Design a protein around this ligand. Structure first.
Ligand SMILES: Nc1ncnc2c1ncn2[C@@H]1O[C@H](COP(=O)(O)OP(=O)(O)NP(=O)(O)O)[C@@H](O)[C@H]1O
Ligand SMILES: Nc1ncnc2c1ncn2[C@@H]1O[C@H](COP(=O)(O)OP(=O)(O)NP(=O)(O)O)[C@@H](O)[C@H]1O
Ligand SMILES: [K+]
Ligand SMILES: [K+]
Ligand SMILES: [Mg+2]
Ligand SMILES: [Mg+2]
Lengths: 610, 316, 609, 145
């Protein structure tokens, strides 16, 4: 019937674009620096074909001059400038991006990396400025003044009351009474060090010293390293770059600089620090900081690494500080983890460098084995622990299976409080007799990784603290069954005394010197796991096994056949051996006062005290 | 579709996970290894599951695709036999990932043959000889045609584009709803002996729940027995159960209406190799607007509640 | 100088609202439901002054009828509708909000709170649809059709081929090929439950069952913040809690308050019965904005559930995040102030506070360690066991009430469990002087006591560490005379242990135990050292003996006979030292050596040579 | 306007440590104890403890400090400067001890002056990590959660 055209309410669109688009008010400085960088790229692209276009102002700089006495924040650049028509068409029309039209005029494959693509980034200055006095100057026109106060209208007047400039645009910002914080030296340097730190052109800031001459300081003192080949970059440049992306004081332990070319164009310079920071990976589009709270970019267990990611081509939002329904992050997530795992393997090739990396990020590597599943096998080869044959240095799981004999089919390990407790545990005597290497786990996060891997190159991970069965000859099983049957009333005697403290009393041959020990029933929390869960701030049955070769156990067996199943002297000694085995196996002792009373009675008995 | 992108400058997304599944349903099937007359033969019959991402995008006129799918198929066939004619066999092929920049030598294939015997040792070199090169050319061609059918749906023709930069880059009454069903497999580090009694012994049920109201004076749960949980808001009834193998409950929430009554089917898959148990829970009958609520709470009131009260596994 | 005006490039501005904003694509359903609620509020406001306006379609509802056969997502409402001129101005001009223009034309003190203020929310349906067919019908006009293909132009044609409606607006969304997920009942109810769950008007959904189609009301639970907390019953709060959160149980406590003035906002805060180990959602104009606000609720107080419905909040163009305005801190302190007052009301009840303290013991004590402004208010809720409260729990204010006149410090002790601290040898000293000692069993108790440091003028003193007590003039001379007599014994125990202890002093705070180990009142306690050495995500000792114990007296006799370097005196010294570590809460290094000593005493008792 | 540098600013911190003033004072001077909470220190003199007008590098050599004045467990003034800082920029940090015998704590009033304008937030967050929390976790002089 009737066909109409879409219109726009100018008196209301200006309020929506300025006030209800950007979250923070400091974003206005990022867009004005980005617009200055785009204008400098236009005159630089024309200087390659016309050197006379750069003779009026050969220095390509960005100068910021705050004036507290006048409440004016002046931002001057030496870009291409705007003519009289561009101040009305490009700058006067909302959503009109002239820099985008300049990118569409040239052929595909140029060396242009301009930032301006939407066309509503200039109006963000009105969040802090009441009225603007943008002054422009082009080579093919005169010098004009663009005055506006976000009141639905602007005026363009020929400049005759201001200083003559060679080429570029001068942005005069009359800040409001409540936005006078952007006139000091501190607030200006915070926004530059946050959004426009890696601008290719130098950003000059006019500071005022004390008696009080005003000077110019380059805010962007570090140049972006992703624009260069990683082979030409030395070690000193990577250290200064790490001290700029983060607030750390020390040098990075390892640098991983890669670049993926193809369907997805993005670069990343990932740094591995020397200590754990206990986000960290920032994202940059067109060499401009977008956001650092990307959760689908880097895993949580891998978030210890520092660095930034240059991903110039990405879907940006109108606020230009958030990405839209990030399905590309999953492609960058798998690429960052893949490059970091390959970087971790390169560190593993060295001996002095991997010792510092593993000692500082031992928890982070083991957290990946517990949480990550697709890359669990790659991270398992990086685990380094101690063993009975590796008491001096840390050994890997790959070196463990190399020293495994031909008759061993499982990987034995043991957990505990510290290294001194697991090295003298009575559970190692059985494996040392059969020449079986047993790993040592000292950190509380070791158990959470082993109950998720469950297999390394076909070898099943078995904990010697739990109930496990060893392989022996057939003639040994025959003679051992007779001793267990002979010690049957001895095991039944220890069961009724302890009661519900243990699940069962069996004769175990995995003990050589210790009289008895306690093991878990292969299900539940182990001796170390139960103690750890009961000691967390933000947050199983026991098996009594005796050794048939100990002289104490043989003496207790002699008391059973003599009718000493209910004697007072035997009940004290069986409870004494039970609570003593709990201390060696790693269990928490209940009511240690009564256990100390048994020791005090033994001390008095030795001192001839009646 | 109608895309309002002047000069094709803005990022326009188009999800193609649906069309990708239908494309593999007509390309992976029907391909065979060898012939039926030979003593060795195999052929894929259907695709098991297609999970991942498959989307096409455009930035400055170039059709980019960053698909990443997990392809798994079921394969049949027969191998040579020592006695009698050839014997049939079944298996499955598992692909870790199919990316956009993957080469021919990058595609991996996890061979999963059912009923592994010493007689079927010649089944692995069979698929690696003629079947695997046929799957590589299909995965490589998947990136070419994907940009050919969905590439024209975006990036409007150059007749309406006035940008040379982008041009050079182009190549009934009131009622209620129906029900649904979910499926999960939580892992527990406990044998099926006490894991079965965990859902039956009333003394143990009150441990990981801390609130229960049993109507009968029985020691443990029996068939056709109702009991309320979580302050009377969770009403479930045991209707069928096997000895440490099957558990069937009639789960029902108090907020649900009368014609809604879900059913939980628990299956025990204890493996003595790793000393664990995978409890396959087949939950059906949940409303469509309640399957996400009862699933997120099952990992908190049923999965983690048991693993923390009895210690049937460490969680961090 | 010429004075021009600001223009707008329609062909580019339209794309700025289509494929540059609204990061997520499910926002189109929320803004369309919100547009239906505003239209229903306009016809409802006119019905109070003109009942004839609500006579065409008296039933107010929002119907959503998905059609997977032709890929059409139809959304019909019975609002005021749009005339032929409104489809061109209100629905054809960017940033033109007819709803906001209707609010500014109302009277003073209106009860209607509409959502439409921006004017660009209607162009969000193009994210999932390539073309829309809006069918409107007003009372003072005919039924028209508003058709557009998300381009730069639209057509308005008189409706003569579709079904005649009484009053309202029908939106036919021709979904794209990739956005066909919004035609199923799962995605439809998911966005409504997430964004438009608390719309005042019922949202009807046409669901096909197994071809009998029926209508289900998606918003079954009406919002409770628009009502007074007095007439709201208990079962209404339980059903409301099960809707804002996926919890199955009933809320333990409900804190519904309302702040008036320049920051009028409603908030119904729920306290669950079990710890959920964000949680507080934000609502503006009956529309869910976001729940990722980190400055709205403290970290230690993140266990509380509920929503906060405010009105004066600066929203962005997408209505999914809040801008920095230095106002969330005012709502932050008001939430903590009301919850602290709510926690005090729970403390008035015995059965209610027992379930709250036993379920959120870590959360209450975490605020004492983290928060400092309300640290004294949170200390009133701390409950612990003691020697005089072995059965039930007692508060810190009840502890000072039972303190004698000669006591000036609050004594406590840390440990791993209650059975370990109840039998500790450090209690015999305070029990003799009738001093109550609290029992700290949780690992977070020491983190809270190391930050409070004072309760009503009483300094918190840990009996595990080294401290001093009061003593009469007759005992100060006797203790000094006995210490100098046992001076060679203290030096005899020092060189044997060496660096294992800092100093060996004779202590009189032990009655039954012959020896004990203390921290030193400056270092980490035995429990604190054990806690730090057991965290998955992550001091000097003092040897004090009791001069009244018979074991110590026998060890003193061996010193004067030249037995300072004997073998038997060195075995008993290391045995007694490591035994005191088990009672004080320390972990024994190399427990195999300690077991070897016990095995040798067993052989001595069994007459084994 | 010529090319130069910016101005200077100041901060004030008061971290609470659970350690007497006698032991905490020796922590910042004993070279054997400095290597514990710093994990890397380079001293140029053979003295057992730090003396007046003595320079030493910390944290791999990026942090240059120098003791210019100190009292008996009461005052500790160091000249703090970073490696990436310019030549004219040289900050001075003062440490004042306040031993509280009633609570068994020591509030170390830190008066740090001479910090560059842009380098303000960097030296404040890292001070709580390399100086405050590092000593509390190495010697057990405070509970960190
Ligand atoms: N300092 C400047 N020098 C020259 N031209 C400028 C300058 N600042 C803005 N312009 C012009 O103003 C136009 C409008 O840009 P603007 O409104 O800032 O958004 P945009 O840069 O085009 N896109 P975006 O920055 O992503 O929001 C640009 O296309 C330039 O031609
Ligand atoms: N279903 C409807 N029935 C009647 N009028 C409607 C309907 N939807 C939209 N309108 C009209 O269209 C105008 C444009 O509203 P809209 O573009 O949705 O933005 P808004 O709702 O006013 N504010 P916002 O949604 O935050 O952008 C409204 O003010 C109404 O006058
Ligand atoms: K513009
Ligand atoms: K509109
Ligand atoms: Mg711009
Ligand atoms: Mg709207």
């Amino acid at each position: 019937g009737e066909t109409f055209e879409f219109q726009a309410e100018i008196t209301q669109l200006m309020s929506l674009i300025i006030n209800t688009v950007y979250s923070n008010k400091e974003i206005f400085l990022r867009e004005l620096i980005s617009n200055a960088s785009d204008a400098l790229d236009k005159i630089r692209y024309q200087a390659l074909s016309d050197p006379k276009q750069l003779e009026t102002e050969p220095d390509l700089f960005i100068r910021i001059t705050p004036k507290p006495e006048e409440k004016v924040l002046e931002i001057r650049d030496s870009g291409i400038g705007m003519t009289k028509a561009e101040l009305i068409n490009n700058l006067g029309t909302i959503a009109k991006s002239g820099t985008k039209a300049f990118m569409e005029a040239l052929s595909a494959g140029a060396d242009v990396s301009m930032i301006g693509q939407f066309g509503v980034g200039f109006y963000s200055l009105f969040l802090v400025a009441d009225r603007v006095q943008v002054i422009s100057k082009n080579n093919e026109d005169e010098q004009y003044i663009w005055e506006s106060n976000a009141g639905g209208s602007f005026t363009v007047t020929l400049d005759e009351v201001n200083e003559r400039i060679g080429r570029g645009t001068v942005l005069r910002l009359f800040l409001k009474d409540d936005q006078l914080e952007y006139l000091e030296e501190k607030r200006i340097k915070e926004v530059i060090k946050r959004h426009s730190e890696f601008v290719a052109y130098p950003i000059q800031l006019l500071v005022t010293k004390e008696v009080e001459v005003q000077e110019l300081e380059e805010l962007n003192k570090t140049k972006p390293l992703w624009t260069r080949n990683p082979s030409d970059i030395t070690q000193e440049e990577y250290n200064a770059f790490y001290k700029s992306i983060s607030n750390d004081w020390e040098d990075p332990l390892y640098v991983k600089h890669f670049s993926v070319e193809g369907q997805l164009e993005f670069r990343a310079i990932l740094f591995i620090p020397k200590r754990a920071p206990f986000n960290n990976i920032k994202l940059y589009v067109r060499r401009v900081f977008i956001t650092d709270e990307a959760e689908d970019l880097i895993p949580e267990w891998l978030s210890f690494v520092k660095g930034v990611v240059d991903s110039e081509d990405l879907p940006l939002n109108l606020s230009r500080e958030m990405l839209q329904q990030n399905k590309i992050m999953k492609v960058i997530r798998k690429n960052i983890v893949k490059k970091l795992i390959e970087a971790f393997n390169e560190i593993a090739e060295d001996s002095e460098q991997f010792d510092k990396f593993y000692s500082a990020f031992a928890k982070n590597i083991k957290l990946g084995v517990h949480e990550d599943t697709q890359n669990r096998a790659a991270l398992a080869k990086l685990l380094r622990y101690n063993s009975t044959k590796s008491v001096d240095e840390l050994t890997s799981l790959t070196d463990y299976v190399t020293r495994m004999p031909e008759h061993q089919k499982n990987i034995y390990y043991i957990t505990g409080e510290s290294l001194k407790a697991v090295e003298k545990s009575p559970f190692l005597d059985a494996l040392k007799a059969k020449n079986f290497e047993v790993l040592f786990l000292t950190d509380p996060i070791d158990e959470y990784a082993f109950t998720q891997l469950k297999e390394f190159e076909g070898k099943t991970l078995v904990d010697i603290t739990k109930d496990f069965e060893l392989e022996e000859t057939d003639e040994e099983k025959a003679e051992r069954e007779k001793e267990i049957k002979e010690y049957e009333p001895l095991t039944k005697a220890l069961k009724d005394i302890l009661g519900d403290q243990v699940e069962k009393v069996v004769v175990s041959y995995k003990l050589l010197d210790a009289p008895a020990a306690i093991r878990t029933g292969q299900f539940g929390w182990s001796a170390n796991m139960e103690r750890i869960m009961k000691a967390q701030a933000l947050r199983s049955k026991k098996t009594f096994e005796i050794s048939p070769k100990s002289p104490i156990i043989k003496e207790l067996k002699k008391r059973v056949d003599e009718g000493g199943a209910q004697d007072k002297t035997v009940k004290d000694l069986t409870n004494l051996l039970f609570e003593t085995a709990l201390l060696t196996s790693g269990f928490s002792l209940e009511e240690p006062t009564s256990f100390a009373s048994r020791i005090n009675r033994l001390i008095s008995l030795g001192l001839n005290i009646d | 579709m109608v895309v309002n992108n002047p000069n094709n400058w803005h990022w326009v997304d188009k999800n193609c996970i649906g069309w990708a599944k239908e494309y593999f349903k007509q390309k992976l099937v029907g391909v065979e290894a060898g012939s039926v007359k030979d003593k060795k033969y195999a052929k894929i019959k259907s695709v098991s599951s297609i999970e991942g991402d498959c989307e096409v995008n455009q930035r400055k006129g170039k059709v980019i695709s960053l698909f990443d799918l997990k392809i798994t198929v079921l394969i049949e066939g027969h191998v040579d036999s020592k006695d009698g004619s050839a014997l049939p066999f079944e298996g499955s092929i598992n692909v870790p990932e199919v990316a956009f920049d993957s080469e021919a030598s990058s595609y991996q294939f996890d061979i999963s043959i059912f009923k592994e015997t010493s007689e079927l040792s010649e089944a692995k070199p069979l698929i690696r000889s003629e079947l695997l090169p046929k799957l590589r050319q299909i995965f490589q061609q998947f990136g070419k045609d994907l940009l050919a059918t969905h590439g024209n749906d975006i990036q409007v023709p150059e007749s309406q584009v006035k940008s040379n930069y982008t041009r050079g880059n182009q190549k009934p009454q009131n009622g209620s709803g129906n029900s649904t069903s979910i499926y999960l497999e939580p892992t527990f580090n406990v044998p099926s002996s006490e894991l079965y009694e965990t859902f039956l012994d009333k003394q143990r049920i009150l441990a990981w729940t801390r609130s229960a109201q049993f109507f009968n004076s029985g020691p443990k749960l029996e068939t056709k027995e109702k009991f309320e949980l979580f302050g009377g808001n969770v009403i479930s009834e045991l209707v069928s159960c096997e000895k440490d193998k099957k558990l069937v409950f009639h789960w029902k929430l108090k907020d649900w209406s009368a014609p809604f009554n879900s059913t939980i089917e628990m299956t025990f898959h204890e493996s003595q190799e790793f000393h664990e148990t995978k409890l396959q829970v087949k939950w059906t009958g949940i409303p469509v607007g309640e399957e996400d609520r009862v699933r997120a709470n099952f990992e908190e009131y049923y999965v983690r509640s048991i693993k923390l009260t009895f210690g049937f596994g460490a969680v961090l």
